[PDB]
Amino acid sequence: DIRPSLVHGQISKCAMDTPYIDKDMIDEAYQLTKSVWLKGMRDELKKVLTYEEAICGSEVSEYISLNEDVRLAVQQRIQAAREGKRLPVPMDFSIAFRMYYLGFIAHLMENRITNEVSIGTNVYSQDWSKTVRKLTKFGNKVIAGDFSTFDGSLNVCIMEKFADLANEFYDDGKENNLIRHVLLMDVYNSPSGNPATTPLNCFINSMGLRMCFAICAKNAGIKMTMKDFGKHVSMVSYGDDNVINFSDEVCEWYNMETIAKAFETLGFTYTDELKVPKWRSIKDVQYLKRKFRYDEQRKVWEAPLCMDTILEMPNWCRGGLDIQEGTKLNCENAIMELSMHEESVFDTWSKIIDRAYANATGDHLDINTYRGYAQERFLEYYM
């Protein structure tokens, strides 16, 4: 349901590990990751949702947001799950997953960034600065990339540890533990992201980057174990995209080149989306399709969108019974998202995008100034 806006086209070893040898390596990364993920859990979120609270939402957290048919499916799916069986997957799934996992997801969202899960990041708030704090915490060296499985022999062993982790959070006993393991088995079968894979993928990032530390250390004779991960690496992930900060000490043997190889021995492909240097500065990486920029005048950390994504934004509309409103909002968002860019840039494209909407609609966009946009963010998230 997408069509063009009123201003459309006017904006111009060499092996692979097996589950047998890495059983203890995984079981130790789970322990090191539990220590981090469960920091800050409140008993107020450790409850299984209802069909209503899954569908409509609860108010226990701000992150908890063909009628009796779907509700009956969900009830039959949880019964199969309770009995240890699995049903086919795709809508009754998502609901049953949310019922049994969204408390945990909300917990992670409430303690975000510092627990390496950046699900919930408010790009325009201090969360960007709080993220730059985390990624410049052991040095000026960072890498950023994204993983893809090509052999899930080891991914499955890691994945079952995600349910184990959520089961530890909720602490609700054997029957709900099994439901959580059974639901997770079809997670894959069912910048936004859904609450089924993105937390899980976050977990694989937190877990695999620890295993690579252990692997990369033994490969290089470093006298460090996975426990030392805490003293040289600080990372955040969003699904399967990550930014990794590492100490200058470990820099030479745990960089982007050695981490990528360590991933291949677990079945993964770690790729650098900004083509490979062994490391980089935080002002060169990209995350959630944005960068990290410091305005050497307003003294703040800001998250400018890709120019490609910003300029392709006034070009389209949701097909409906408002299309001038679509072109309006998207031109306004695109200018607002230009506000976090370098002011030179904002002057150039706010003019173009605004002249186009007017010189096509006989209207004018409801925009702000470079300073004004900044101030509306300052007034909202910083004091």
Side-chain angles (χ1 to χ4, degrees), residues 283-288 290-295 297-298 300-315:
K283 293 200 199 155
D284 316 310
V285 313
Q286 215 194 62
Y287 187 52
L288 313 170
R290 321 175 177 249
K291 272 171 153 226
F292 294 102
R293 186 189 63 112
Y294 199 71
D295 196 11
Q297 315 199 259
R298 296 178 292 103
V300 277
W301 277 108
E302 279 171 353
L305 260 282
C306 185
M307 282 312 274
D308 296 281
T309 315
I310 274 187
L311 301 195
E312 197 67 32
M313 201 173 179
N315 262 293

Side-chain angles (χ1 to χ4, degrees), residues 48-51 53-54 57:
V48 188
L49 295 191
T50 76
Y51 180 94
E53 303 191 274

